[PDB]
Each structure stands twice: as C-alpha cells, then as structure tokens.
C-alpha cells in the first residue's frame, strides 16, 4: 500500500501498456518510475495543466522557485530547504531543473507521504511523536534503527517537540534524496556488477549517512 519499492500500477492509470516503453530509458530505469503508473488519468491532466501554466519560457522543466509555487497534496507548501531536497531526488547532476515526468513523480511521492502521515495520526493529535517516526518510515520502505529515527526528528523539526506534516515531508524528502544518492554511488562501474535493490541493506546505508548530518 505504502511501500515505495513495490507500488502496484493502478487501474485507470494515465498510461496504456505500450506507453511505458515509449518513456525514455532515463526515466524507465529509475527507482521512482513505478510512481508514474500509479497516477490516474484525471490527476495527470491536472498536473500537466499546472506545469504548462508555470513553464512560461516553454523549456519543459521546472526549477526550485517554480516548484515552490506548487499546490501540493494536503496543502503542503515547500520550505526552501525541503524544496532543495525534493529537487535533488531527481536532479542528480545539479542542473537545478527537473523534467515533467520527474515533477509528476515528486507530486505523487508527496501525496503518498501525506497519506501516510494521516494514516499514522491514529490519536488525531495532528502530529507524530518522535517514537512514531520509525514504524511510519518502515511502511514507506525505509528501514532505519531507533537512533536514526530520533536524529531525523532532531535534524528536521526546527526545534519543535513533535513531528508535524512539514517535518515529516522534510524527513521523507531526505530519505528519498538519500535513495537517489545510493543509486548514484553504486551506478559507478568501479564497484562491479550492480546488486539488486535490497531495502534491509539500504537501511544500513541510510543509518550511516544520517549520522553524518549530525
């Protein structure tokens, strides 16, 4: 339902079966590509309409200041800091621009992360306490240990006691950004033939890397 690594394509997706292979391999081959096939036709049309409207120079890309104008699921408004992390899930060579398919995926990633926060606010307090962060990330497919969980709150909560939607979205941006970093590292053919993605093993990477931000 929420696992980033095995999102089922939906009925009534905006793409027909052959369209998948019309996508450039650049998009096709990415870890986040399955997000695209969970977007229904009407959400696609809406996202497309928006992007064309902000894309005043007709470049086919957004940069961070256009991204921050976005009207995101749950009324999420992006901080500069979080918008940068979000761009960097997709912009892995610091162009400072994302494509339309990358934006589509970012938007659907935000919706999934929103929905997940709401699902986990079982007591309807409107926030997550820091000890609630770990099982929620686990549902998304990020397997971390308790120390990494509590450091994530520290790092991204801007001093607040609990984890509001803004802090959750920053944590999820960082976690996905880190997933793209892992790809970029291990894409390097110096490491030899690439091992398949394993969430348990990735989690150890996320633990070690999160420590470095302290």
121 binds Mg ion (CB under 5 A): no
Min. distance of Cβ 118 from Na ion in angstroms?
Answer: 10
User: For residues 86 and 9, what is the distance between their CA atoms, to the nearest angstrom?
Assistant: 23
65 binds Na ion (CB under 5 A): no
153 is in an annotated binding site: no
Three-state DSSP at 33 gives helix
91 is in an annotated binding site: yes
How many residues lie near Na ion (CB under 5 A)?
3
What is the distance, to the nearest Å, from the Cα of residue 160 to the centroid of all Cα atoms in its chain?
Answer: 23
45 or 125, CB closer to Na ion? 125
- Using CB under 5 A, which of the segments 47-55, 71-79, 116-124, 203-211 binds Na ion? 116-124
User: For residues 138 and 38, what is the distance between their CA atoms, to the nearest angstrom?
Assistant: 20
Query: Which residues are CB-contacts of 141 (< 8 A; sequence separation ≥ 6)?
Result: 2, 3, 4, 5, 199
User: For residues 161 and 207, what is the distance between their CA atoms, to the nearest angstrom?
Assistant: 22
- Encode burial over 167-180: b for 16+ CB neighbours within 10 A, e otherwise: bbbbbbbbbbbbbb
164 binds Mg ion (CB under 5 A): no
Any bridge partners for residue 13, and if so which? Answer: 40
* DSSP state at residue 69: T
**Residue in 48, 55, 92, 100 binding Mg ion, rule: CB under 5 A:** 55
Any bridge partners for residue 40, and if so which? Answer: 13
Q: What does 211 interact with, of its own copies, Mg ion, Na ion, none (CB < 5 to 8 A by kind)?
A: its own copies
Min. distance of Cβ 131 from Na ion in angstroms?
Answer: 11
Position of minimal CB gap to Na ion? 125
Min. distance of Cβ 63 from Na ion in angstroms?
Answer: 35
Min. distance of Cβ 84 from its own copies in angstroms?
Answer: 7
C-alpha dist (Å) from residue 192 to 185, 186, 188, 195: 12, 9, 8, 9
Nearest of 103, 92, 101 to residue 184 by alpha carbon: 92
Which residues of the shown chain bind its own copies in the complex (CB under 8 A)? Answer: 84, 88, 94, 147, 174, 177-178, 181, 184-185, 188, 190-192, 195, 198, 201, 204-205, 208-209, 211-214
- Which residues are known binding-site members for Ca(2+)? 55, 57, 59, 61, 63, 66, 91, 93, 95, 97, 102
- Which residues are known binding-site members? 55, 57, 59, 61, 63, 66, 91, 93, 95, 97, 102
């Amino acid at each position: 339902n929420f696992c980033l690594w095995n999102l089922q394509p939906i009925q009534g997706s905006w793409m027909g079966a052959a369209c998948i292979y019309q996508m450039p391999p650049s998009v096709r081959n990415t870890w986040w590509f399955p997000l695209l096939n969970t977007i229904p036709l009407d959400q696609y049309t809406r996202i497309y309409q928006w992007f064309m409207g902000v894309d005043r120079d007709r470049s086919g890309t957004l940069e961070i200041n256009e991204l921050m104008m976005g009207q995101f699921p749950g009324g999420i408004r992006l901080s500069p800091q979080t918008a940068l992390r979000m761009m960097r899930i997709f912009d892995t060579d610091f162009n400072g621009h994302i494509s339309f398919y990358e934006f589509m995926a970012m938007y659907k990633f935000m919706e999934l992360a929103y929905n997940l926060f709401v699902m986990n606010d079982r007591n309807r307090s409107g926030t997550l306490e820091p000890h609630e962060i770990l099982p929620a990330l686990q549902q998304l497919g990020f397997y971390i240990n308790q120390r990494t969980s509590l450091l994530l709150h520290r790092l991204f909560a801007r001093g607040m006691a609990f984890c509001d939607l803004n802090c959750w979205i920053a944590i999820c941006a960082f976690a996905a950004q880190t997933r793209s970093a892992y790809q970029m590292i291990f894409m390097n053919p110096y490491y030899g033939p690439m091992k398949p993605f394993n969430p348990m093993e990735f989690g150890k990477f996320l633990d070690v890397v999160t420590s470095l931000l302290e």
